[PDB]
């Protein structure tokens, strides 16, 4: 049980860190893309008004 | 205003509830149709406690019938007063309980329970403010016993600030109906002591003996017992139904009557139990009523209160006599019969007189007490449960339902704790 | 032909859980006449799948356990069931064969049953 | 003066309209002949809304029946009230739609459309000033859905300042009638969200469940559903048909009940749905009606509003009760059921009571609100449409009709945008 | 010794997990505000049309 817990925790937490890193980079890319859309969409709506 | 919601469970509970409804309709003056045919004064003001105001003055009952077998519905509806109730409250399933507590609580207590909670919550919301809930059931089966505990637990969890009184039927080794009755009783008692305010003890053998030896009936049937218990509850509830001089209520009794929450059982009883040929020869007076409320012969218990000590006593009268004789009678009883009540607690009798007489009888008085007499029943239940559980007979049926055997271990452990507590409080000595 | 001749007065409506259950053609190899469907990268479905994956990743971050599209589906099904509205008295969850055999299907009034 | 022009489409729409006309004729005292046999007071002043003044006091209906199958007019004419309408309004073609939307709109929607436009114009100019146009149809087929969208679009293009209210029928995967029904629904929702003021959601499976579980009908048929929807629409329009103290109208409801033009769907419903044996035992009061208009059991949806948050609620009453009880009820509802409506927008319930009671019944109140429950219908419709459109089954018919497939692409794109909007506004957070 | 080393790993693994939870939530509220702006902006353009 000692060993089994050791490797189980190791693998679980490693994959947790990896997936959290993937989520963080995805989220930052999403926010950048959104704010660019923000700016150009501002210009579009103002000019058409 | 202050109304009471009544609950029904078990075929015996169903029939006793129906008999109670018929009795109270007869004495408050209600025709079987649904209109009003009474001729009294107080029978209109506080009549809304058990009824509900509707158009045309046609009052409706407030009782939810819970059952697992449709055969009870047709029986209770065919009666002379079975057409006055609300058919919506008759929530019944399709499969019988089989006198199994675990199976009924698991299978027939999941997909049907939602309807009864919906109807009871609608009933509770329909009124402004309530006091408690009355449920009449029996432990002899999986319908009343399996479902009543669950419903009581649910209503306690939802509405903790309410009164939970019940008149469940205790079993008897001499007069039995179910082979696995000890198991159902053991499972019921845990919920009754954990999630129940108060509980009244009901036995059939004692009532049969009382009627046979005093009423001297030719063919006493369940109808007689239902009438007796209906009169008992009517006398209990008249403190709120019919105000007199010294009115009481359920929660005041439950607080003043119960020294410890783990001990909430009582001993009910009615005084004037006379034969047919003795009705025209009787002296209606105080000491006679006192002697019939004090002696164990009129008591409906299948045990002997003389084996222990009286803990709490309350004498609820109904009629027009007075106070003084009651207090002097209880004083001289405490003086003379000093070895029958706890000496550490003086004045163990509560006085309660209802100035409003009942219908059909002029003098009436019930006995609500908690004497040291149930310990024998508890210990015999414990020993029979231990004998059953030693070799694990009639256990594969409960095992196949899914629930384990450990529940029995904790139930019997709680039973042993309770009986030890009861016996070591029985000899409530003053000091060392 | 062999069945029709041996049993004589037999059709293929004479179906029962028997060793001769001609469906056993398929049981030999379910993959026969079957095509593997790995998770594809169809952008039409991906238009919603990206949002679903974003929600799943947010939930995983808030919890801390890896979840797949299926695992996600079951966990929100479970949380919706535990959310309270299970709907156990309406056609949103009940089986088709759970309405005809209902006391509410006994419109024939209880008066005749009282007579019985 | 202020009149409403009624429109018809689809055999289901035709029959429900006929049922509605019969219901209102019976309510307002109209014999099947065409004369007047009423005995009320408000049944003469505002009677001209749906009728037209003619010689001899013989009022005529104002409704144009649009269909492609001649078999419908013969059916609806043979009834007890089919001889009172205008046969000119029965504009019918020679070929059937075949449950095809593209074919019906293209083939049977070019040469036959001119006549119905001519008649609806002649009706519009026959009156002085109008408010809007009512069209009752269904999306189950090419008759109601194929031409209802086109006629609504045309009348909007002609008269933009009019009420586009409709009672189309939503499909159900459980209870289906057309194989290509999802395609027709996808084509119809685009026009309903692009060129329609407001639309109500109608389901037959939900009504079937309601009648089965509450009305307890022996043999429920389409006639019962037609009666229910007729009563629903009658309760809707009585705000204008029968003025009372707090009178409302269709445009007020449309403006106050629609936060965004893209989301103009609603949730209709009627409160008093009881069984035949329960009509003689009921308590007529405010809280009961409140519970029946608030619970999801009495609603006519095949979904659950408790899955989302309440957006807009209008409680239209028809009777003589009060004003205080309604506001206190909605107040305590918003207080206790705080997790069921948008917290960002207080007081989402509108007050509306009609002092004029309906004929035949003394208490009635309908429920019109837009709750967050249609999202599941929309998402499942989108899913099934995607599943069907992946491999293009049942598409060669539409292709051979002439229309291309990019229409499906843009329709599903709009559908995805709509569901995304609905879901991201469902969780209307106060701030970050 | 194996147990102490692996617990010393687990503590920092969970610490990093929580920090990434914070980062992801911040990015998600940024996405939320950007999306609200998406919505009223595209409403403005459809109304313009």
From Swiss-Prot, chains A, E:
**Record note on quaternary structure:** Interacts with SPAG6 and STK36.
Tissues with expression? Expressed in testis.
What's the stated role of this polypeptide?
Necessary for sperm flagellar function. Plays a role in motile ciliogenesis. May help to recruit STK36 to the cilium or apical surface of the cell to initiate subsequent steps of construction of the central pair apparatus of motile cilia.
Subcellular localization, as worded in the UniProt entry: Cytoplasm; Cytoplasm, Cytoskeleton, Cilium axoneme; Cytoplasm, Cytoskeleton, Flagellum axoneme; Cell projection, Cilium, Flagellum
The name under which this protein is listed is: Sperm-associated antigen 16 protein
Query: What domain of life does the native source organism fall in?
Result: Eukaryota
Q: Which organism is it from?
A: Mus musculus (Mouse)
Posttranslational modification: Phosphorylated by TSSK2.
Residue stretches in coiled coil: 1-49
Swiss-Prot record, chains B, D:
Q: Which residues carry this modification: N6-acetyllysine?
A: 58
User: What does the UniProt record tell us about how this protein is modified after translation?
Assistant: Some glutamate residues at the C-terminus are polyglycylated, resulting in polyglycine chains on the gamma-carboxyl group. Glycylation is mainly limited to tubulin incorporated into axonemes (cilia and flagella) whereas glutamylation is prevalent in neuronal cells, centrioles, axonemes, and the mitotic spindle. Both modifications can coexist on the same protein on adjacent residues, and lowering polyglycylation levels increases polyglutamylation, and reciprocally. Cilia and flagella glycylation is required for their stability and maintenance. Flagella glycylation controls sperm motility. Some glutamate residues at the C-terminus are polyglutamylated, resulting in polyglutamate chains on the gamma-carboxyl group. Polyglutamylation plays a key role in microtubule severing by spastin (SPAST). SPAST preferentially recognizes and acts on microtubules decorated with short polyglutamate tails: severing activity by SPAST increases as the number of glutamates per tubulin rises from one to eight, but decreases beyond this glutamylation threshold. Glutamylation is also involved in cilia motility.
UniProt cross-references to SMART domains, sorted A to Z: Tubulin (SM00864), Tubulin_C (SM00865)
* PTM annotation (Phosphoserine): residues: 172
Output the Gene Ontology cellular-component terms: axonemal microtubule; intercellular bridge; mitotic spindle; myelin sheath; sperm flagellum; tubulin complex
Residues reported in the UniProt entry to bind Mg(2+): 69
Motif MREI motif, residue range(s) on this chain: 1-4
Q: Which controlled-vocabulary keywords does the entry list?
A: Acetylation, Cell projection, Cilium, Cytoplasm, Cytoskeleton, Flagellum, GTP-binding, Isopeptide bond, Magnesium, Metal-binding, Microtubule, Nucleotide-binding, Phosphoprotein
InterPro entries recorded for this chain? Answer: Beta-tubulin_BS, Beta_tubulin, Tub_FtsZ_C, Tubulin, Tubulin/FtsZ-like_C, Tubulin/FtsZ_2-layer-sand-dom, Tubulin/FtsZ_GTPase_sf, Tubulin_C
Tissue spec: Widely expressed. Expressed in the retina and the cochlea.
Provide the leader sequence positions. Answer: none
Whether Magnesium counts among this entry's keywords is yes
As cofactor, the record names: Mg(2+)
Question: What's the name of the protein?
Answer: Tubulin beta-4B chain
From Swiss-Prot, chain C:
Q: Which family does it belong to?
A: Belongs to the FAM228 family.
Q: What is this protein called?
A: Protein FAM228B
**Which organism was this protein described from?**
Mus musculus (Mouse)
Gene it is expressed from: Fam228b
Query: Which residues of the intact protein are shown?
Result: 117 to 232 of 232
């Amino acid at each position: 049980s000692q060993v089994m817990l050791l490797e189980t925790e190791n693998k679980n937490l490693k994959k947790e860190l990896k997936h959290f890193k993937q989520a963080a980079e995805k989220a930052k890319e999403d926010l950048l893309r959104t704010q660019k859309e923000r700016d150009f969409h501002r210009m579009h709506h103002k000019r058409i008004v | 205003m202050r109304e009471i919601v009544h609950l029904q469970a078990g075929q015996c509970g169903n029939q006793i509830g129906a008999k109670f409804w018929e009795v109270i309709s007869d004495e408050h003056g209600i025709d079987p149709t649904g209109t009003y045919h009474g001729d009294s004064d107080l029978q209109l003001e506080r009549i809304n406690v058990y009824y509900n105001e509707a158009t045309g003055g046609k009052y409706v009952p407030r009782a939810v019938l819970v059952d697992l077998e449709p055969g009870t519905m047709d029986s209770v509806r065919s009666g002379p007063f079975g057409q006055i109730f609300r058919p919506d409250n008759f929530v019944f399933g399709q499969s019988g309980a089989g006198n199994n507590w675990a199976k009924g609580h698991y299978t027939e207590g999941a997909e049907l329970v939602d309807s009864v909670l919906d109807v009871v919550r609608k009933e509770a919301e329909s009124c402004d403010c309530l006091q408690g809930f009355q449920l009449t059931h029996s432990l002899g089966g999986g319908t009343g016993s399996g479902m009543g505990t669950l419903l009581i637990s649910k209503i306690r969890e939802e509405y903790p600030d309410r009164i939970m009184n019940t008149f469940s039927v205790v079993p008897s080794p001499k007069v039995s109906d179910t082979v696995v009755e000890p198991y159902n009783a053991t499972l019921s008692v845990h919920q009754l002591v954990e999630n129940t305010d108060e509980t009244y003890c009901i036995d059939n053998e004692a009532l049969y003996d009382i009627c046979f030896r005093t009423l001297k009936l030719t063919t006493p049937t369940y109808g007689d017992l239902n009438h007796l218990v209906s009169a008992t509850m009517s006398g209990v509830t008249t403190c709120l139904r019919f105000p007199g001089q010294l009115n009481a209520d359920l929660r005041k009794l439950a607080v003043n009557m119960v020294p410890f929450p783990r001990l909430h059982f009582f001993m009910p009883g009615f005084a004037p139990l006379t034969s047919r040929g003795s009705q025209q020869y009787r002296a209606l007076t105080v000491p006679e009523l006192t002697q019939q409320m004090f002696d164990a012969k009129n008591m409906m218990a299948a045990c002997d209160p003389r084996h222990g000590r009286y803990l709490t006593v309350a004498a609820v009268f109904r009629g027009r006599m007075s106070m003084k004789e009651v207090d002097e009678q209880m004083l001289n009883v405490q003086n003379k019969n000093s070895s029958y009540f706890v000496e550490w607690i003086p004045n163990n009798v509560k006085t309660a007189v209802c100035d409003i007489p009942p219908r059909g009888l002029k003098m009436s008085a019930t006995f609500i007490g908690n004497s040291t007499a149930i310990q024998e029943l508890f210990k015999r239940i414990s020993e029979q449960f231990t004998a059953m559980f030693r070799r694990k007979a009639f256990l594969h049926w409960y095992t196949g339902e899914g629930m384990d055997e450990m529940e029995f271990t904790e139930a019997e452990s709680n039973m042993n704790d309770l009986v030890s507590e009861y016996q070591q409080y029985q000899d409530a000595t003053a000091e060392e | 032909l062999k069945h029709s001749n041996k049993k004589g007065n037999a059709f293929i409506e004479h179906y029962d859980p028997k060793e001769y259950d001609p469906f056993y053609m398929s049981k030999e190899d379910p993959n026969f006449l079957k095509v593997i469907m790995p998770p594809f990268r169809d952008p039409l479905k991906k238009a919603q799948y990206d949002q679903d994956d974003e929600k799943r990743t947010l939930l995983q971050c808030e919890t801390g356990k890896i979840y797949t599209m299926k695992e996600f589906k079951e966990i929100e099904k479970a949380q919706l069931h535990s959310r309270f509205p299970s709907i156990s008295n309406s056609r949103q969850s009940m089986t088709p064969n759970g309405w005809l055999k209902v006391p509410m299907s006994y419109i024939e009034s209880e008066f005749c049953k009282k007579s019985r």
